[PDB]
Amino acid sequence: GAMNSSNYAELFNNDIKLFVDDTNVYRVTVHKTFEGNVATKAINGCIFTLNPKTGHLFLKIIHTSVWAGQKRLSQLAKWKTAEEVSALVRSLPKEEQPKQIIVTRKAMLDPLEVHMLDFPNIAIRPTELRLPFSAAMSIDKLSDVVMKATEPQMVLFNIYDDWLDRISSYTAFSRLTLLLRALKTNEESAKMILLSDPTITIKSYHLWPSFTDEQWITIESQMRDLILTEYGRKYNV
Amino acid sequence: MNTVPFTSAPIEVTIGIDQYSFNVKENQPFHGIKDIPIGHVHVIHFQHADNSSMRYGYWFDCRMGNFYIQYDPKDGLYKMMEERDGAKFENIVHNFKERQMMVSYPKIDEDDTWYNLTEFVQMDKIRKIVRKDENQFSYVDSSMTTVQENELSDPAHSLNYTVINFKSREAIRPGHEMEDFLDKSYYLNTVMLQGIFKNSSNYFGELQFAFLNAMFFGNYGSSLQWHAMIELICSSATVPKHMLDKLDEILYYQIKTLPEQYSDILLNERVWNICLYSSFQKNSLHNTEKIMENKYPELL
Ligand SMILES: COC(=O)CN(C)S(=O)(=O)c1ccccc1
């Protein structure tokens, strides 16, 4: 059933699974009209579909043209997400298809279940974890490819870069969630932490800087501090 | 007017006949029910005084044969049987009437309740839901499960209601996933009405039969079916106008007849609130919404 703290290690076993986050599928700017009413303007979005074991991010870019002439966009966006995840699964060889799909928001359950009726053996699951995948748009290279898209497009990224050469998927996921939680809580500070040192670069084929093991511990500490810091700034503690 | 004689009443029992009921004491001189209106199905039902476990009963139509009730001390229940010897039966009934050992079906002349609850219910369709083809009447009890309940375990004793499942390939056209899930008109009108039921009369008949088994036997799977069939219509944007008007009448009389103290188990809060206030047909069930709001305003 629901994925939570009690069964967290299940994420890193050898049953193929995907997280699906739909937060950034339908994105808008709200603005005033000449007449002084309010309107929205859509901008490009993305489905965040992630294998937590391997770091495989299938980033389906959602181009604003998909909303043209459509009504009830926040509802459509869930069904569009489900249609695109179902299309992704059907595109994979059988031995690569997931056994479970975990949605980060419960409103994706029925749309995804209905789109996956053809896959009765794929379990569609919610989670009680508050995962920070909305902050994916705070990763510069992901934001860049989404905003530049002129048409629907799927882009592939290892969200762990090469970390699995040195650490387990449990530890890589924990690092990822810490980074994304930081970026979500205070993007400016988080990005300052990550880039303040010009000698540490991001490889062309990576998302995050090339920290040594020792530097990752420093970095991870700074992200915790930031999250605890902002938690006081917010609550006055 | 027809008659269902009883051989005897050896155990204390509450006997129902349609929406009526009366208490019979152990070895009281009771020999059946007379003046039963011809033209409708009927249900005769039982709850033993010593064990309210298992309400049970029989759906029958007196036009289809001469039926009587006889207690079986081995199986421990009142059984319906058919008497094939017409002269024997007529002679039995006439004697029991002459000795006035029969209760009269107590229908008030003004009162259309039973007609309104059984308008579309036919014995031939009951017998396809309740399979026991060697009898002209159909046994139902509180514990019998539905075909759908058994897919989620004795097949011979099942209620074979039409399976309705809103998250199923039958309900959902490939490529119309969002459309068909949010507007069930395809599933209602093409799959169920045109495809399975053939017409709305048969649909309403099963809906009414499911309600009556829920009310009279506390049959939980029947209650599930009744609510599913309501929800499928209410969740369809495109429903023939005559079906909506008739549905409103059907549900009105069901809600009217429901015992007040059973509303908590016989009525599904989610389905009714959705149907009356959120669904496409939220404004199409005037009679049903008015009686629900005046009789069960708590549920809503
Ligand atoms: C869908 O997969 C991915 O997002 C990740 N990979 C298959 S990969 O092996 O890391 C990779 C493969 C091709 C391109 C970039 C990365």
Side-chain angles (χ1 to χ4, degrees), chain A residues 49-51 54-59 88 92 96 154-159 161 205:
Chain A
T49 299
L50 170 66
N51 188 327
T54 61
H56 288 181
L57 169 49
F58 298 75
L59 191 81
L88 169 64
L92 294 161
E96 300 181 34
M154 167 81 90
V155 188
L156 308 189
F157 284 101
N158 192 308
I159 203 155
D161 296 342
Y205 50 88

Short mmCIF file of all heavy atoms in Angstrom, two decimals, chain A residues 49-51 54-59 88 92 96 154-159 161 205, ligand 1:
data_model
loop_
_atom_site.label_atom_id
_atom_site.label_comp_id
_atom_site.label_asym_id
_atom_site.label_seq_id
_atom_site.Cartn_x
_atom_site.Cartn_y
_atom_site.Cartn_z
N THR A 49 9.85 11.62 -13.25
CA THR A 49 9.71 10.18 -13.11
C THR A 49 11.09 9.61 -12.83
O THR A 49 11.96 9.64 -13.70
CB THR A 49 9.10 9.54 -14.35
OG1 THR A 49 7.79 10.07 -14.58
CG2 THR A 49 9.02 8.03 -14.22
N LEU A 50 11.26 9.03 -11.64
CA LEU A 50 12.59 8.73 -11.12
C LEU A 50 12.69 7.29 -10.63
O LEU A 50 11.86 6.87 -9.82
CB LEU A 50 12.96 9.66 -9.95
CG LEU A 50 14.22 9.29 -9.17
CD1 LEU A 50 15.47 9.44 -10.09
CD2 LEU A 50 14.31 10.14 -7.89
N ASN A 51 13.70 6.54 -11.11
CA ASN A 51 14.05 5.26 -10.50
C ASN A 51 14.96 5.54 -9.31
O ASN A 51 16.09 5.97 -9.52
CB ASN A 51 14.73 4.33 -11.51
CG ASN A 51 14.94 2.91 -10.97
OD1 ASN A 51 15.16 2.70 -9.77
ND2 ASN A 51 14.83 1.94 -11.85
N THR A 54 18.47 3.44 -9.32
CA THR A 54 19.50 3.68 -10.33
C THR A 54 19.78 5.15 -10.55
O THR A 54 20.81 5.47 -11.18
CB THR A 54 19.06 3.04 -11.65
OG1 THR A 54 17.83 3.64 -12.10
CG2 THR A 54 18.82 1.55 -11.45
N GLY A 55 18.89 6.07 -10.15
CA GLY A 55 19.01 7.51 -10.40
C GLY A 55 18.45 7.93 -11.73
O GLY A 55 18.66 9.06 -12.08
N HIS A 56 17.75 7.06 -12.44
CA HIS A 56 17.22 7.30 -13.80
C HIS A 56 16.04 8.27 -13.76
O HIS A 56 14.98 7.86 -13.35
CB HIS A 56 16.88 5.97 -14.45
CG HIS A 56 18.09 5.20 -14.83
ND1 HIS A 56 18.02 4.01 -15.44
CD2 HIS A 56 19.40 5.50 -14.70
CE1 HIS A 56 19.24 3.58 -15.69
NE2 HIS A 56 20.09 4.47 -15.25
N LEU A 57 16.22 9.51 -14.18
CA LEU A 57 15.15 10.52 -14.26
C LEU A 57 14.65 10.60 -15.69
O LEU A 57 15.42 11.07 -16.56
CB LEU A 57 15.69 11.87 -13.82
CG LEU A 57 14.76 13.04 -14.10
CD1 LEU A 57 13.37 12.71 -13.61
CD2 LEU A 57 15.27 14.31 -13.48
N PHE A 58 13.46 10.06 -15.97
CA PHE A 58 12.79 10.23 -17.27
C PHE A 58 12.06 11.56 -17.15
O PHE A 58 11.03 11.53 -16.49
CB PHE A 58 11.82 9.10 -17.57
CG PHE A 58 12.45 7.75 -17.68
CD1 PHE A 58 12.86 7.06 -16.55
CD2 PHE A 58 12.61 7.15 -18.91
CE1 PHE A 58 13.43 5.81 -16.65
CE2 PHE A 58 13.12 5.87 -19.00
CZ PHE A 58 13.57 5.22 -17.87
N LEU A 59 12.57 12.65 -17.75
CA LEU A 59 12.02 13.98 -17.59
C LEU A 59 11.20 14.26 -18.84
O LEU A 59 11.76 14.57 -19.88
CB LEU A 59 13.14 15.00 -17.36
CG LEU A 59 12.60 16.35 -16.91
CD1 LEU A 59 12.28 16.37 -15.40
CD2 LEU A 59 13.62 17.41 -17.25
N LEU A 88 5.27 5.87 -21.32
CA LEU A 88 6.66 5.53 -20.98
C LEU A 88 6.78 4.06 -20.64
O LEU A 88 7.64 3.35 -21.17
CB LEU A 88 7.15 6.40 -19.83
CG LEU A 88 8.50 5.96 -19.21
CD1 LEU A 88 9.62 6.07 -20.26
CD2 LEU A 88 8.84 6.72 -17.95
N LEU A 92 8.98 0.79 -22.67
CA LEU A 92 10.13 0.07 -22.13
C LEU A 92 9.99 -1.42 -22.45
O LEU A 92 8.87 -1.96 -22.46
CB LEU A 92 10.23 0.26 -20.61
CG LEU A 92 10.56 1.69 -20.18
CD1 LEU A 92 10.20 1.93 -18.74
CD2 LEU A 92 12.03 1.98 -20.39
N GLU A 96 12.30 -4.12 -18.27
CA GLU A 96 12.57 -2.81 -17.68
C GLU A 96 11.33 -2.13 -17.12
O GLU A 96 11.43 -1.06 -16.52
CB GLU A 96 13.23 -1.90 -18.73
CG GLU A 96 14.55 -2.50 -19.21
CD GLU A 96 15.24 -1.60 -20.23
OE1 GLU A 96 15.11 -0.38 -20.07
OE2 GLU A 96 15.87 -2.12 -21.17
N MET A 154 11.12 14.25 -24.33
CA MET A 154 11.63 13.48 -23.20
C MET A 154 13.14 13.63 -23.13
O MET A 154 13.83 13.41 -24.14
CB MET A 154 11.28 12.00 -23.35
CG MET A 154 12.02 11.10 -22.40
SD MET A 154 11.22 11.13 -20.85
CE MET A 154 10.16 9.77 -21.23
N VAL A 155 13.65 13.99 -21.96
CA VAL A 155 15.09 14.11 -21.72
C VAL A 155 15.47 13.16 -20.58
O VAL A 155 14.80 13.14 -19.54
CB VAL A 155 15.48 15.55 -21.36
CG1 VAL A 155 17.03 15.71 -21.31
CG2 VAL A 155 14.90 16.48 -22.43
N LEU A 156 16.62 12.49 -20.72
CA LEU A 156 17.15 11.51 -19.77
C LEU A 156 18.31 12.12 -18.96
O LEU A 156 19.19 12.74 -19.57
CB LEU A 156 17.59 10.32 -20.62
CG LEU A 156 16.50 9.82 -21.56
CD1 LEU A 156 16.88 8.53 -22.23
CD2 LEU A 156 15.19 9.67 -20.79
N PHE A 157 18.28 11.97 -17.62
CA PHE A 157 19.34 12.43 -16.71
C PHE A 157 19.57 11.38 -15.64
O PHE A 157 18.62 10.74 -15.25
CB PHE A 157 18.90 13.67 -15.93
CG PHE A 157 18.92 14.94 -16.71
CD1 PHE A 157 17.76 15.47 -17.23
CD2 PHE A 157 20.11 15.57 -16.97
CE1 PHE A 157 17.78 16.62 -17.99
CE2 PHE A 157 20.14 16.73 -17.73
CZ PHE A 157 18.98 17.24 -18.25
N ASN A 158 20.81 11.15 -15.26
CA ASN A 158 21.04 10.39 -14.02
C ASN A 158 20.96 11.53 -13.03
O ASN A 158 21.85 12.34 -13.03
CB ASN A 158 22.35 9.60 -13.92
CG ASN A 158 22.35 8.64 -12.75
OD1 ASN A 158 22.07 9.01 -11.65
ND2 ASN A 158 22.61 7.37 -12.97
N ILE A 159 20.03 11.51 -12.08
CA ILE A 159 20.00 12.54 -11.06
C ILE A 159 21.07 12.35 -9.98
O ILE A 159 21.23 13.22 -9.12
CB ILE A 159 18.58 12.63 -10.44
CG1 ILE A 159 18.40 14.02 -9.84
CG2 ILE A 159 18.37 11.52 -9.38
CD1 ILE A 159 17.01 14.47 -9.73
N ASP A 161 24.30 11.70 -10.82
CA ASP A 161 25.60 11.78 -11.54
C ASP A 161 26.28 10.42 -11.40
O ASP A 161 25.69 9.39 -11.76
CB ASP A 161 26.43 12.96 -11.03
CG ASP A 161 25.80 14.31 -11.29
OD1 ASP A 161 24.89 14.44 -12.14
OD2 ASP A 161 26.21 15.27 -10.60
N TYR A 205 28.37 16.49 -18.37
CA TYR A 205 27.37 15.43 -18.36
C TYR A 205 26.78 15.18 -16.96
O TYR A 205 26.17 14.13 -16.73
CB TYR A 205 27.97 14.15 -18.94
CG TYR A 205 29.30 13.75 -18.35
CD1 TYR A 205 29.38 12.95 -17.21
CD2 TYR A 205 30.48 14.19 -18.90
CE1 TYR A 205 30.61 12.61 -16.67
CE2 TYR A 205 31.69 13.86 -18.38
CZ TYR A 205 31.76 13.07 -17.26
OH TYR A 205 33.01 12.75 -16.75
C1 LIG C 1 16.21 7.10 -18.85
O1 LIG C 1 17.27 7.05 -18.34
C2 LIG C 1 17.90 7.91 -17.66
O2 LIG C 1 17.38 8.89 -17.33
C3 LIG C 1 19.17 7.57 -17.31
N1 LIG C 1 19.83 6.52 -18.05
C4 LIG C 1 19.24 5.40 -18.87
S1 LIG C 1 21.36 6.65 -17.93
O3 LIG C 1 21.76 5.46 -18.15
O4 LIG C 1 21.72 7.25 -16.84
C5 LIG C 1 21.52 7.55 -19.10
C6 LIG C 1 21.32 7.06 -20.33
C7 LIG C 1 21.26 7.87 -21.38
C8 LIG C 1 21.40 9.20 -21.16
C9 LIG C 1 21.62 9.68 -19.92
C10 LIG C 1 21.69 8.84 -18.93
#
